[PDB]
């Protein structure tokens, strides 16, 4: 038991360690999506940049949870980072749809972490999650939804014109 540990439940500790793995996984999915758009037969450079940015943010989120763990006197236990579900992400629209899905899954896990912190009366953990994670996640999900909507309305994925112009005018 850490000399700093206070009001920090075993279950919260375990849940943070799960959250660290999930942020790392999300980072990995976005890394895979970015370089898919860097292929010579896909060639949408701003989709690639957009997803590489999201990838580095997810890693940064992981790092902040790892800092949180040590702050509270918890002990970090890392797990394998699972390769993503796809190697080939099909189109800019499909990738955005999969990103939206992934962000909601990460959000659900954040919400469950907050429920747990509430159940354990850990107001420091509750506020940490609300301050750094919940509103950022909500903004991301709204942005990914906006992107999906625009791509669909432009006639993606069928219109390669649509994905080309979106890359230029929205992601550029």
Which residues in this chain contact Ca ion in the complex, by CB under 5 A? 80, 127, 130
User: Which is nearer to Zn ion, 39 or 67 (by Cβ)?
Assistant: 67
- Using CB under 5 A as the binding rule, the residues of this chain from 14 to 33 that contact Zn ion are 23
The angle subtended at Cα 30 by Cα 25 and Cα 33, nearest 5°, is 130
Out of 16, 77, 116, 120, name the contact with a copy of itself by CB under 8 A.
77
Residue 23 binding: pick among Ca ion, Zn ion, a copy of itself, none (C-beta 5-8 Å cut-off by kind):
Zn ion
Round to whole Å and give the CA distance between 141 and 104. 7
Site size toward Zn ion, by CB under 5 A: 3
Instruction: Answer yes or no whether residue 114 interacts with Zn ion by CB under 5 A.
Output: no
- Using CB under 5 A as the binding rule, the residues of this chain from 50 to 109 that contact Zn ion are 58, 61
Round to whole Å and give the CA distance between 108 and 38. 30
Write down the residue that tokens 């919400």 correspond to.
111
Residue 141 binding: pick among a copy of itself, Zn ion, Ca ion, none (C-beta 5-8 Å cut-off by kind):
a copy of itself
Q: Which residues of 45-60 are buried (b: 16+ CB within 10 A; e: fewer)?
A: ebbbbbbbebbebbbe
Instruction: Answer yes or no whether residue 158 interacts with a copy of itself by CB under 8 A.
Output: no
Round to whole Å and give the CA distance between 93 and 158. 10
Round to whole Å and give the CA distance between 161 and 169. 12
User: Which is nearer to Zn ion, 115 or 139 (by Cβ)?
Assistant: 139
Least distance in angstroms from the C-beta of 25 to Zn ion: 10
Beta carbons of 96 and 144 less than 8 angstroms apart: yes
- For Zn ion, the binding residues (CB under 5 A) are 23, 58, 61
């Amino acid at each position: 038991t850490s000399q700093v540990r206070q009001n920090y439940h075993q279950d919260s500790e375990a849940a943070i360690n799960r959250q660290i793995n999930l942020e790392l996984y999300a980072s990995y999915v976005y890394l895979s999506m970015s370089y898919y758009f860097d292929r010579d037969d896909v060639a949408l450079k701003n989709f690639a940049k957009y997803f590489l940015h999201q990838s580095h943010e997810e890693r940064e989120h992981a790092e902040k949870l790892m800092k949180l763990q040590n702050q509270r006197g918890g002990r970090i236990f890392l797990q394998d980072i699972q390769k993503p579900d796809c190697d080939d992400w099909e189109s800019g629209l499909n990738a955005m749809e999969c990103a939206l899905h992934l962000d909601k899954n990460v959000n659900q896990s954040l919400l469950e972490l907050h429920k747990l912190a509430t159940d354990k009366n850990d107001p420091h953990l509750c506020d940490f999650i609300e301050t750094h994670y919940l509103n950022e996640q909500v903004k991301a999900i709204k942005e990914l939804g906006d992107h999906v909507t625009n791509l669909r309305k432009m006639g993606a994925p069928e219109s390669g014109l649509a994905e080309y112009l979106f890359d230029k005018h929205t992601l550029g």
